[PDB]
Design a protein around this ligand. Structure first.
Ligand code: HEM
Ligand SMILES: CC[C@H](C)C(=O)N[C@H](CC[C@H](Cc1ccccc1)NC(=O)OCc1cncs1)Cc1ccccc1
Length: 449
């Protein structure tokens, strides 16, 4: 089993019995991945316990697996762990079930819908400003994640279900999904357990989170079913009259999670950058003022007008792609771009690493929004820079997240400035676990303008 990459003649760190190359995750697997890239070059193999994982870095090879051979050979992400009813969630579902869930849910994020979520969020901008304006008094540090997390929550519920639960006025989901903890280490390493827990009804999500979201999303549901907008919660009612009940809740939980957790983490990273780069912060405050004269209310079209904003957002995502790695399980023997990949292998694209490769980026540790200007934008390979994945299985929420973040940014910057305080971590360190987090909360002071 551990003979695979020696047999295919693919380079790699030497696996230990049982553990595989697991111990190398000790100092976080963005580092492991960087090390590997440097040490082995363009393609390598390692073992999550007994699982062979082939890393590929060739822009062409990546396009083939992400785009060309998706439907046929590379359709599914890793077999994750013990999901429960979340088996149905779109990001977890495989093969046919996924295709069906995809075109069922993909119309959720069209122009018209998006355009129709600009006024809905437009009330949450007004409550985010107000929250911060109150927090500008004390003049002490601040936790961006906490104030930003509640914004995300509010936007997600109100659009996807059209349910205002006014989170911004009420100070589960963060307790949802540990590497050091024997847990994922006993599964990421050891998968043979999984079918057991599926009978034990044990879940990667605590029973109490999903039970809440269960009866809660069952409640946002009831209200609709009698009283007489074509939205997310509405779209899934369409299919029920070939969708089902727990399949409806499943999609909801992923969406609530995605929209809450990622949106706020990214927004924290951007603010961190704008403080630690005030010139960039000013240039943006300028653009915002140029497009929106007089602290005016952002809009769908005025949002797309802002080039430098988009450049800022893109460059944060170069440094801090919250996914680390894209993955695709190889479901039949295959030969892509002159390389043989056997059925069963997990093909891995090390996004964080390629986003930092001395090859495609000069000065790759530095935050340089300009590397994204219309002048330079075309020298950038859509297959080295993939914060949203690519091909059919790419991020369905991309356009919502970008607009939502930007709406959060426009309004916040047309009202406030951001500066490091003494409880700001300069520079920033990543925590070692799964998705990209800062090892200490991002904390910054906030002047009124
Ligand atoms: C800045 C915030 C976000 C980032 C950086 C982001 C990034 C990604 C990435 C890299 C993937 C995998 C694509 C692939 O493997 O090719 C992904 C998948 C997905 N994302 Fe997004 N995402 C973000 C926000 C969202 C939002 C707001 C939603 C919807 C509410 C969303 C829903 C999904 C779903 C359902 C999948 C799995 C797609 C499928 O298999 O059909 N994520 N996300
Ligand atoms: C490598 C094994 C690891 C356990 C794994 O497969 N998970 C990651 C992380 C996936 C987690 C899974 C999850 C956590 C908590 C609740 C539900 C599911 N994140 C996830 O699917 O979030 C939805 C998102 C969409 N866009 C960004 S996050 C792979 C992945 C899937 C989808 C998008 C990006 C990366």
């Amino acid at each position: 089993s551990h003979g695979l990459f020696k047999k295919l003649g693919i380079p790699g760190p030497t696996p230990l019995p049982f553990l595989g190359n697991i111990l190398s995750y000790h100092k976080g697997f963005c580092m492991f991945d960087m090390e590997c890239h440097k040490k082995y070059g363009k393609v390598w193999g390692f073992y999550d316990g007994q699982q062979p994982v082939l890393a590929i870095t060739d822009p062409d090879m990546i396009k083939t697996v992400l785009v060309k051979e998706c439907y046929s050979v590379f359709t599914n992400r890793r077999p994750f762990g013990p999901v429960g009813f979340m088996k149905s969630a779109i990001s977890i579902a495989e093969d046919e079930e996924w295709k069906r869930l995809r075109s069922l849910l993909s119309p959720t994020f069209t122009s018209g819908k998006l355009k129709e979520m600009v006024p809905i969020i437009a009330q949450y901008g007004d409550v985010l400003v107000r929250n911060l304006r109150r927090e500008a008094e004390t003049g002490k540090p601040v936790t961006l994640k906490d104030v930003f997390g509640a914004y995300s929550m509010d936007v997600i519920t109100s659009t996807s279900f059209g349910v205002n639960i006014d989170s911004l006025n009420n100070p589960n989901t963060k307790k949802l999904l540990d590497f050091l903890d024997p847990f994922f280490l006993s599964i990421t390493v050891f998968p043979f357990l999984i079918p057991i827990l599926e009978v034990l009804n044990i879940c990667v999500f605590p029973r109490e989170v999903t039970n809440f979201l269960r009866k809660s999303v069952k409640r946002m549901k009831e209200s609709r079913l009698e009283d007489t907008r074509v939205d997310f919660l509405q779209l899934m009612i369409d299919s029920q009259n070939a969708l089902s009940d727990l399949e409806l809740v499943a999609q909801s939980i992923i969406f609530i999670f995605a929209g809450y957790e990622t949106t706020s983490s990214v927004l924290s990273f951007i603010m961190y950058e704008l403080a630690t780069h005030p010139d960039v912060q000013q240039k943006l405050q300028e653009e915002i003022d140029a497009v929106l004269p007089n602290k005016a209310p952002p809009t769908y079209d005025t949002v797309l007008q802002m080039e430098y904003l988009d450049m800022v957002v893109n460059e944060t995502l170069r440094l801090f792609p919250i996914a680390m790695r894209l993955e695709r399980v190889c479901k039949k023997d295959v030969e892509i771009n002159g390389m043989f990949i056997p059925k069963g292998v997990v093909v891995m694209i090390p996004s964080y690493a390629l986003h930092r490769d001395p090859k495609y980026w000069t000065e790759p540790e530095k935050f340089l929004p300009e590397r994204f200007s219309k002048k330079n934008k075309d020298n950038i390979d859509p297959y080295i820079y993939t914060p949203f994945g690519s091909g059919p299985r790419n991020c369905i929420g991309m356009r919502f997240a970008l607009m939502n973040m930007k709406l959060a940014l426009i309004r916040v910057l047309q009202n406030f400035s951001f500066k490091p305080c003494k409880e700001t971590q300069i520079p920033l360190k990543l925590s070692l676990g799964g998705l990209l987090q800062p090892e200490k909360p991002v904390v910054l002071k906030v002047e009124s303008r």
